Every structure is written in structure tokens, then in C-alpha cells.
Design a protein around this ligand. Structure first.
Ligand code: 94T
Ligand code: K
Lengths: 7, 694
């Protein structure tokens, strides 16, 4: 639900 | 044996990065010996590396049909299915491999990784420890485990863990293996700048190896703007045109470009998620191309060349959904890193990184493989003025005058306030104060009873905890709310009568040193609390325990759930002060707190990632919130929590300067970015090569 910066 | 010599050569060709030669040799092995289980599985693995996922699956199944207990084939097949988004198929394969051989370390590690990606951190840690028990020298499992532990703030043996990560990277670099620390994660660990740069370089190298199978010559690039009617063709490449932080920062930029001098192409690497973020960039860019429909990187890169792009802008770096194979092929004469990735690419194929003096001072320029291209204020930008214009002004309810206990925001706030009898206007420009009253009491009752909304004098008055029930697009920041919203400390269990320090970052950005600083501050300021998020929830008891060992009772730290985007931004108005994470700053999260008018104390480090908040604050014009060391950070923070007139001054300053400074001014930003793009273009068109820009 909460998009974030990810590798 | 002829077969095995071909296979063994292919294996080495693969490790070197000669993918085409490896494929060719595995196929030779299978001509000579068709029932060669290992050759099928190895060919499958290299086909998977090239994106040929169905062809890979076919060879993995042939390997298993030949050797039904080939655990390794099942493990690698599981990875292929995970890459195709078949999580169920992937788990069926991993679990089958571990059933065949419970001592097979790699399968445990692959299972761990899918647990991690699914949000099951405790099971991922457990499976990684099984892998490391089985094979104690296993860098991938150790470094992935170290990230899991970071995510939940498990700091058991922290200093030896960190030394071991550095040790693994040193060893991996000297042996020219792919480092097990991901480039994006490398900012969190005490590695040298050379090591961080080298980790990045080696990851960029995987993209170079993948494009060599294509056999593309150099592309020929424009030397002037004649084909484009005097317009610089700028191409923005991103997997994040959609509901993602980077779109929440830059979604207005494409449409603000001057069409007399620029032509804007947005290349999406992701399909359309159905959100207004995607709608807006599609509508407003001069051209929008969906490269998610063009899987082959050769054909996708050709399109960028024949669009005639002058500056290709990399918004992913080493984040999820990147296709840096596109940039490895150099379809454009200038290639720049911008905004989405807070580090260097380490790659020769990227020419500039767009940054600024505060974020990346000329001294530390050897962090970066790219040349520095300075924006004049900060390279950071936020779409907050367009997304959350309802937070531009606020009113309060005087319960017992505080600016951050019971807050009202809305586009129609003025008209609601004008409908009320006894409103007091406090100069700061100003803050309307509703006094305790039948109306004021009706509002507080909605909040205390957890009701969704009420009506006062015909106005819709919404509970800030219920936004997804009222308008789910307003909750996500896709629409501006059309009701007046009420936000309170009581909603989040925060004290009415004490200082609230907040930090709204994911818990992985906190380290022992940081929490020790925060504990020192809280002990200096009685009754005050630290407001953190369950990000994730399983990090909570670790933080609370390490804080208890530092001497804080449990009531000093209050955890709230992660909120929808609009609530998150809005609720930052309830804090007094934000305490930024020095290890890795709030980036988007930093823009978010400042938009609420909340001062943010920061201590810039050396990495780009540790200096973003200080660049934001410099642009904003609040140099007094930037600490040079830990003692300063604590003194600033304690001063803000005790000197209440100085707090009121600093808050008043953030509240005004979020509008009057350049920080959130997307038009000014776009114009400054345009000047910088023309410098880059002219410098090159005059025959020169990439050089630093200041
Ligand atoms: C590349 C990301 C730059 O931003 P950063 O500060 O690192 O933020 P991430 O952790 O990558 O993403 C956080 C993302 O979550 C939103 N958020 C935070 C908290 C909350 O309760 N609700 C949210 O919606 C942030 O606004 C940000 O977009
Ligand atoms: K188990």
C-alpha cells in the first residue's frame, strides 16, 4: 500500500 | 567428458560475463550429450539472465525430468518464477528444493529472499541463519541478512556486523566478484567512498555485459538542435511514473518545461497503474512512451535514438524497475542521473549527476564517477504545493494558544471561519483561532468518538483518520481534499502538554548512534516524546528496548501506523520538531515535514544521502537547524524543545519560507534545470566532453 524507494 | 569440458568452459565464460559465448557452449554440450541435466540447468540460468524466462523454464524442467532430485534446478527455477511474479510457483519450487536436500544453503537463501520481499522479515532472518549455519562463508546471505536486521533495528553485535560487511566487500572487490552489498544499501554501512563507488561500478557492469549480446555499434548523436526546430529534446526515464515518491516530487516538471526551447519525452519503464500521477505525466509531457511494452533493450534503446534525444535522464539508478541497459547502449549524447537515486552510478555510461553545492561539495567529488552538475539552490524538489494546497493555511481550536494540538485545514476554511461568531486572528501571516464553544465542542466530540464526519453551518468537517472512507484519491494525494479536515494530537495518543519530536522515516535509517542522540535529547526535555512509525511494526520492540537500556522509560516513544500519503503530510503539523536521521536523511520524507511547517534538525554526513536534508534546509533558509556534530544536534533540538519563543520564531520561519523560498517552487526549479540543461548541451556541442559545472 505505501510505495517507497527500494533496491 | 567432451560434454563436461564444454559445460565447464561455459561456466567460466558466464562468471567472466561472456553471456553469448556461455549460451553457445551449453548448447554445444547438449548436442553432444542431450540428457545432460547440469547443462540444461546452467543454460536455463543464463537464458534467465537474458530475460528469456519461458525458454529457461523449459530447460529447468528438462534438467529435473533427467534428474528428479536435482535440488539446484528447482532452486533456480524458483527464481525464474519469482521474476515472472509467480510467487506461489516460486514457493513451491523453493520448498521442493529444501525437501530434496535440507542442507542446501542456496535454496534456504532464495526462500529467505522471497519471505523478505513478501514482508515476512522474521521468517527471512530465520532462513538466512539456516543458510549461514549450513555454509558459513556465504556473502549474499550474510549481507541480505544484515539488511533484514537493519530493517527491524536489530543491532545485536552491530559493530562487528559492520566490520564484517566491509571485510566481505574488500574481499569481493579484490577478486572481481559482484559485491553482495547492493549499491542502494551501501549508504547505510561504514564503507569507504572508494568502496561505495566500486560497488556501484560493478553493478553497472552487469548491464554492459547484458547489452554485448546485441552487437550494437555506437549510435550517432545530434551536434546541433536543427532537426528539433531549435528545441533541446530531454528524455526522462523512470519506472516510477505512478504512485511512487519520485512522482510525488517531480510530476509537475514535465508540463512546466518551456516548449519554445525544450521538447519533453517521458519513457516509462512500468505499465500504467491507473493513478492520477501517471495520468498527469502522460497528459503534460510532449511525448509519453511506454517502454514496459518493449521488453527487449535493443529495440527500446533504438526508439530513444530515433526520438533524437539530446539529454537522457536516469531517474532510477539502482532502484527497483531500473533498465540501465538502456543507458549502457548510450542512445543519447548526454546522460544524467537525477533525483530518484541518492548515490553515484559508478558507471562510465552516465555523464553527469544533477546535485548541488550543499549536497555534493566539490571536495567530496571522488564519491562520484559522474561530473557534478550543480543546481543553484537544491537539486531536491517536491510537488507539495500542487498536491496539498489545503495545508498552505491552517486554523486551530483553543481547547484551554497552541499551533499544533487541534488543527483545521481546507480549501474552504476561510468561508467556514467567516460563518462563525467569535474567531480570533493571531499574527505570526496569520492563524485563526476558534474558541471553546458549541461548534468547537461538536468538533472535539467527532474526534473523541472516532466518527467519520459532521456538518457545521453547511460545511463538511471530516475526521483526518477517515480520509480513505471519504475520498480515497484525496487520501493518496491524487486529488485535493474537498472537505475541511480536523487533525489532533489526541487522535495519535500524543501529549497535549509536551514537546513532540517526530521522525517519519522507515526504521532502517536509524542506527545505535542516532537513537543515543535522541535519547539524550529526550532526557534533557522532561515530558517530551519521540513520535515514530511502525515502519515496519516488528521494529518497534527493538527500538523500545535499546531506548530502555539507554535510560528512557517506554512512554517517551510513541509509535503510530504508516498513514495514507495526505494524512502523513497533514499530521506532521502536530509535531513541534522533526529529528532527521543522520545515517540516511529523510529525502521525500524531509520535504513532507517541511510542508507542514515543522522545523527539521539535521547533521549532514559525507554521502549524498546523509546531506539531502541540510541542502533542503539551506534552500529553505534555516541554517540554524543544521548541526556540524552530535553535540550541536542535541543542543539545537533541546533549545527548540525548551526555549518556546525561539521555537515559535523558527516554526514561523519554516511556515513562511515554504512558500517564499525556492524549495517547493516547481516553476522556478524547472527554469533553473532548463538553464543547467543548456549549459550541458552547449559544452558538448562545442566539441568538449563532460566536465564539472559550477
Ligand atoms: C527515494 C525515496 C526518497 O524518500 P525517502 O524519504 O527515502 O522515503 P522512502 O522511505 O523511500 O519512502 C517513503 C514514502 O512513504 C510516504 N509515507 C511515509 C509515512 C507515512 O506514514 N505515509 C506515507 O505515505 C512518504 O511520503 C514517501 O513518499
Ligand atoms: K522452519
Amino acid at each position: 500500500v505505501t510505495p517507497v524507494c527500494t533496491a | 567428458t567432451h560434454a563436461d569440458s564444454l559445460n565447464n568452459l561455459a561456466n567460466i565464460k558466464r562468471e567472466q560475463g561472456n553471456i553469448e559465448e556461455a549460451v553457445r557452449l551449453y548448447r554445444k554440450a547438449l548436442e553432444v550429450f542431450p540428457e545432460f541435466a547440469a547443462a540444461h540447468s546452467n543454460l536455463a540460468s543464463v537464458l534467465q539472465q537474458q530475460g528469456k524466462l519461458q525458454e529457461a523454464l523449459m530447460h529447468y524442467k528438462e534438467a529435473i525430468r533427467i534428474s528428479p532430485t536435482f535440488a539446484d534446478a528447482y532452486s533456480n527455477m524458483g527464481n525464474t518464477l519469482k521474476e515472472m511474479q509467480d510467487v506461489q510457483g516460486a514457493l513451491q519450487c523453493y520448498t521442493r528444493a529444501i525437501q530434496i536436500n535440507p542442507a542446501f544453503a542456496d535454496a534456504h537463501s532464495n526462500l529467505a529472499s522471497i519471505h523478505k520481499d513478501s514482508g515476512n522479515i522474521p521468517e527471512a532472518i530465520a532462513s538466512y541463519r539456516t543458510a549461514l549455519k549450513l555454509k558459513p562463508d556465504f556473502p549474499d546471505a550474510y549481507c541480505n541478512l544484515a539488511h533484514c536486521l537493519q530493517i527491524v533495528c536489530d543491532w545485536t553485535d552491530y559493530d562487528e556486523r559492520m566490520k564484517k560487511l566491509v571485510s566481505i566487500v574488500a574481499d569481493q572487490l579484490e577478486k572481481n566478484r559482484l559485491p553482495s552489498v547492493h549499491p542502494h544499501h551501501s549508504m547505510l554501512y561504514p564503507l569507504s567512498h572508494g568502496f561505495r563507488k566500486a560497488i556501484a561500478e560493478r553493478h553497472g557492469n552487469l548491464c554492459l555485459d547484458k547489452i554485448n549480446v546485441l552487437h550494437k555499434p555506437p549510435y550517432e548523436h545530434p551536434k546541433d538542435l536543427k532537426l528539433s526546430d531549435g528545441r533541446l529534446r530531454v528524455g526522462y526515464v523512470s519506472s516510477d511514473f505512478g504512485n511512487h515518491p519520485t512522482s510525488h516530487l517531480m510530476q509537475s516538471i514535465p508540463g512546466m518545461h518551456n516548449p519554445d526551447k525544450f521538447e519533453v519525452f517521458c519513457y516509462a519503464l512500468s505499465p500504467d497503474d491507473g493513478t492520477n500521477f501517471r495520468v498527469k505525466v502522460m497528459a503534460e509531457a510532449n511525448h509519453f512512451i511506454d517502454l514496459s511494452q518493449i521488453p527487449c533493450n535493443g529495440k527500446a534503446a533504438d526508439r530513444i535514438h530515433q526520438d533524437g534525444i539530446h539529454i537522457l535522464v536516469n531517474m532510477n539508478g539502482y532502484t527497483k524497475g531500473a533498465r540501465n541497459e538502456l543507458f549502457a547502449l548510450r542512445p543519447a549524447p548526454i546522460q544524467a542521473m537525477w533525483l530518484g537515486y541518492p548515490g553515484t552510478s559508478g558507471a562510465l555510461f552516465m555523464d553527469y549527476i544533477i546535485t548541488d553545492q550543499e549536497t555534493s561539495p566539490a571536495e567530496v567529488a571522488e564519491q562520484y564517477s559522474e561530473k557534478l552538475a550543480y543546481m543553484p539552490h537544491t537539486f531536491f524538489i517536491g510537488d507539495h504545493a500542487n498536491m496539498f494546497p489545503h495545508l498552505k493555511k491552517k486554523a486551530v481550536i483553543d481547547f484551554k494558544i497552541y499551533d499544533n494540538r487541534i488543527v483545521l485545514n481546507g480549501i474552504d476554511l476561510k468561508a467556514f471561519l467567516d460563518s462563525l461568531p467569535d474567531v480570533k486572528i493571531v499574527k505570526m501571516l496569520n492563524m485563526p483561532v476558534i474558541p471553546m464553544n458549541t461548534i468547537a465542542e461538536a468538533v472535539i466530540e467527532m474526534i473523541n468518538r472516532g466518527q467519520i464526519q459532521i456538518t457545521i453551518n453547511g460545511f463538511s468537517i471530516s475526521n483526518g483518520l477517515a480520509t480513505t472512507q471519504i475520498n480515497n484519491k484525496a487520501a493518496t494525494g491524487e486529488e485535493v481534499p474537498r472537505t475541511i479536515i480536523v487533525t489532533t494530537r489526541s487522535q495519535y495518543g500524543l501529549p497535549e502538554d509536551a514537546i513532540v519530536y517526530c521522525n517519519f522515516n522507515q526504521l532502517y535509517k536509524i542506527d545505535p548512534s542516532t537513537l543515543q542522540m535522541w535519547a539524550n535529547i529526550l532526557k534533557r526535555v522532561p515530558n517530551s516524546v519521540l513520535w515514530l512509525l511502525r515502519f515496519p511494526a516488528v521494529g518497534e520492540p527493538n527500538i523500545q528496548q535499546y531506548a530502555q537500556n539507554m535510560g528512557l522509560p517506554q512512554n517517551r516513544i510513541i509509535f503510530s501506523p504508516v498513514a495514507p500519503k495526505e494524512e502523513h503530510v497533514r499530521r506532521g503539523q502536530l509535531a513541534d520538531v522533526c529529528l532527521d536521521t543522520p545515517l540516511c536523511n529523510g529525502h521525500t520524507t524531509g520535504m513532507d515535514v517541511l510542508w507542514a511547517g515543522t522545523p527539521m534538525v539535521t547533521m549532514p554526513g559525507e554521502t549524498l544521502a546523509s546531506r539531502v536534508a541540510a541542502s533542503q534546509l539551506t534552500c529553505l533558509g534555516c541554517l540554524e537547524l543544521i548541526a556540524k556534530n552530535r553535540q550541536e544536534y542535541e543542543d539545537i533540538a533541546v533549545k527548540l524543545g525548551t526555549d518556546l519563543e525561539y521555537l515559535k520564531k523558527v516554526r514561523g520561519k519554516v511556515w513562511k519560507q515554504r512558500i517564499s523560498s525556492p524549495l517547493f517552487n516547481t516553476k522556478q526549479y524547472t527554469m533553473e534545470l532548463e538553464r543547467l540543461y543548456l549549459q550541458m548541451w552547449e559544452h558538448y556541442a562545442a566539441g568538449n566532453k563532460p566536465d564539472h559545472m559550477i
